[PDB]
Structure formats: structure tokens, C-alpha cells
């Protein structure tokens, strides 16, 4: 026939072309959602990667701010493959190259012979360094 033979082919063909766009648009492993506290994030924003040793290990979800302290907070996420960090781990904001995007860095200190889990906060941090206060304190 012409009515029944061509109605079920359009159901499967439209569902296959629409599902091919769902995979192609990148719409497809747990973390423990660390939190930090800085004073000058600089050029940090959402979907910014976090790195250690030069290669990236995760991304930053969003940057919030508490109205009682008025300091920027980071909601970065590092995966389960790297957990053994001490409480003296320094956080530093570094720039990829010269004029690239900014990223966080984990300066691992000397471990004393605690681990960070859900709800912890990195104590020792170092914020981004702007180029305004360095030249004003050097050529003066």
C-alpha cells in the first residue's frame, strides 16, 4: 500500500536523525566538590579548568560570594583518581603561557607522617596577582 507502508518508516528515520544530533552535541565519573576561599580571582569564571603538574584534572563549576565575608569562593571539582593531598596544600592561580586563560594549581606540600573529602575547605591559598600593584610598588 501507500499509507501503511510509509507511516512507520518516518517514525524510525526521524528518531534516528534526532538521536544523532543528541550525541553530536556532546550531551553525554564522580567528584567530591572541593571548596576554596580567595580574595582576588582575577580572570576566573565558570567552566575554567583546574590543573596540577601542567595538565588539567577537572573544571570549576561556578564562583559564588558570601555576603557576610565578601570574598570570592571557588567550587572546583577534582576527580576520585587523585585524593592523597595534605591539609598544607597551597592553591595558586596560574596563567597558561603568557596571555592565555587562568587556571588553579595545587602546590602539594610536605605530608606529616588529613585527606580532603565532602565538605572540606583548602586553608592555604594564594589569589591572582594583578599588574597594577606590582609596578606601583616597584617604580616608586
Amino acid at each position: 500500500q501507500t499509507k501503511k507502508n510509509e507511516i512507520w518508516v518516518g517514525i524510525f528515520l526521524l528518531a534516528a536523525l534526532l538521536a544523532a544530533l543528541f550525541v553530536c552535541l556532546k550531551a553525554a565519573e564522580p567528584t567530591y566538590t572541593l571548596y576554596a576561599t580567595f580574595d582576588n580571582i582575577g580572570g576566573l569564571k565558570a567552566r575554567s579548568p583546574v590543573s596540577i603538574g601542567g595538565v588539567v584534572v577537572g573544571r570549576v563549576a561556578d564562583i559564588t560570594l558570601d555576603p557576610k565575608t565578601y570574598l570570592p569562593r571557588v567550587t572546583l571539582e577534582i576527580e576520585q583518581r587523585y585524593n592523597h593531598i595534605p591539609d598544607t596544600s597551597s592553591l595558586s592561580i596560574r596563567t597558561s603561557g603568557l596571555l592565555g586563560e587562568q587556571y588553579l594549581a595545587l602546590n602539594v606540600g610536605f605530608e606529616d607522617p588529613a585527606i580532603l573529602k565532602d565538605g572540606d575547605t583548602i586553608q592555604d591559598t594564594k589569589s591572582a596577582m594583578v599588574l597594577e600593584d606590582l609596578i606601583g610598588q616597584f617604580l616608586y
Binding site: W8, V9, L14, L25
Partner: protein, 258 residues
């Protein structure tokens, strides 16, 4: 509710059977018995009016877009010391977005409108109905050689559009305005790389060749056999292909180029 306000009808059942009619038109024209020696003179005959005759509007128009890419790439880089990177703008534009998209719009205009008019005139004069009567399938006789001709022509016509458009930028960039040829080709040869500019230019040229040929062969097959149905399907071929080439251009750039 039963009237045309909410349940207006003829929009979920209609324009969905045409998707099923287009799926059965391509499946019955590509899956069958292997006939290599039979379709061997049919592929060469249908390559003249698809690939050879469409080469006229690409060579003379490749230097038109290739020269204005060098005119607009000069005055915007004066205060940035990017005069030695003159091939940085011409080669990267004609290998990523310009090229396989602009040639597909010329393929849908010339070869896309001719393939709709060819099959539409066969159904108006009942040539496909008389061919079907003499114990042979009209699907794997005239549609199947026209599909494989349009698939292999558009990547073979994109590389002509790239090389002419790069040479079109060399006639306005190297010859005119006094730019060194050693500084021009050094921004093209060892600046851009493989698998981002060369392979991806040929990946999207194949998918654009399938989508344009499938639309142009469906409007010529699913049409009204009269003098006004061929002219209506010729207009709808350019509309459905311009929204499919430019529509998939945002879809295909999700994986590649960051």
C-alpha cells in the same frame, strides 16, 4: 478543540510520511544486487551534467571570493603588525567555513535544481512509469547513478574551490600591495596543520554531498506530474538545502575546532 485551534491536523501525519517516502526511496536504490558493469557507463554519463557542468560556476567564482578575502584581510590588520600573516586569514577561512558550505550552495543551485528538473520531467512525460513496465526497477536505473555522481562530485569540487580561492588571494595579496612571497607561504605551509584543516574539510564535504543529493532526488520523485509541480519542486529544493547545509554547519562544528 476538535477544530483547527489545537487539533488542527494534517501536520503530524502529513510531512512525516514524506520522511518515510524519502527513506524508502534511498534504501531501495542503494541496497540490491551488485551491478558494476551495468552502471559503469551510467556513472560516467551522469558525471558530466553533475560534476563537469558545475565546474564553470566554481572556477570564475573562486577568484571572486578569494580576492575579497584578501581585500578585507588587509585593512583590518594594519595596526596589529599582522601583514606577514596574510595567508593566516585566507587559508583558514576557505578550509573551515568557506569552501564546503559555499560550494554546497552552488551545488544546490545548479546541480540541485537540475536533478529535481530531470526526474520531474521524467514523471511528467511518464518515462519512469514506462521504464518500470519493461521488467526493470526505475529506482536502481536513474536514481542510483545520479546519487553516486552527486556524492563524489562535491568533495572533488571543493578542493578546486579551495585551490582557486587560495590562488585568488595570492593575486591580490602577493602581487598587489607588496607582500613578500616568503612571508606569505610561511603563514600557510608550516602554520596550519593536518587533521584540523585538511581532513575536516573533506569530512563535512561528504555529509553535505549526501544531504543535498537526497533532497534533490526526493523533490524530483515526490512531485505532481504537471507543468507547475516541477517548478514548485525546483524552488523547494534550494530552500530545503540552504537550511540543511547552514543548519548542519552549526551541528558539525561541535566536535571539531574546540
Amino acid at each position: 478543540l476538535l477544530n483547527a485551534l489545537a487539533s488542527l491536523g494534517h501536520k503530524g501525519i502529513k510531512t512525516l510520511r514524506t520522511f518515510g517516502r524519502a527513506g524508502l526511496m534511498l534504501f531501495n536504490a542503494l541496497v540490491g544486487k551488485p551491478e558494476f558493469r551495468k552502471h559503469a557507463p551510467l556513472l560516467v554519463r551522469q558525471l558530466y551534467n553533475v560534476g563537469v557542468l558545475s565546474m564553470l560556476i566554481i572556477v570564475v567564482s573562486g577568484v571572486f571570493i578569494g580576492m575579497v578575502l584578501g581585500l578585507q584581510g588587509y585593512l583590518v590588520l594594519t595596526t596589529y603588525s599582522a601583514e606577514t600573516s596574510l595567508g593566516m586569514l585566507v587559508a583558514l577561512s576557505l578550509l573551515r567555513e568557506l569552501g564546503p558550505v559555499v560550494a554546497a550552495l552552488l551545488f544546490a543551485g545548479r546541480a540541485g535544481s537540475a536533478l529535481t528538473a530531470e526526474i520531474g520531467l521524467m514523471r511528467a512525460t511518464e518515462q519512469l512509469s514506462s521504464m518500470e513496465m519493461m521488467a526493470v526497477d526505475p529506482l536502481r536505473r536513474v536514481i542510483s547513478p545520479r546519487f553516486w555522481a552527486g556524492v563524489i562530485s562535491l568533495p572533488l569540487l571543493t578542493v578546486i574551490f579551495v585551490a582557486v580561492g587560495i590562488w585568488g588571494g595570492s593575486l591580490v595579496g602577493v602581487s598587489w600591495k607588496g607582500i613578500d612571497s616568503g612571508f606569505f607561504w610561511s603563514a600557510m605551509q608550516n602554520a596550519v596543520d593536518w587533521r584540523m584543516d585538511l581532513v575536516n574539510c573533506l569530512i563535512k564535504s561528504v555529509v553535505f554531498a549526501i544531504t543535498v543529493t537526497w533532497i534533490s532526488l526526493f523533490n524530483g520523485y515526490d512531485a505532481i506530474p504537471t507543468s507547475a509541480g516541477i517548478s514548485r519542486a525546483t524552488t523547494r529544493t534550494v530552500v530545503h538545502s540552504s537550511l540543511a547545509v547552514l543548519g548542519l554547519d552549526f551541528v558539525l562544528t561541535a566536535l571539531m575546532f574546540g
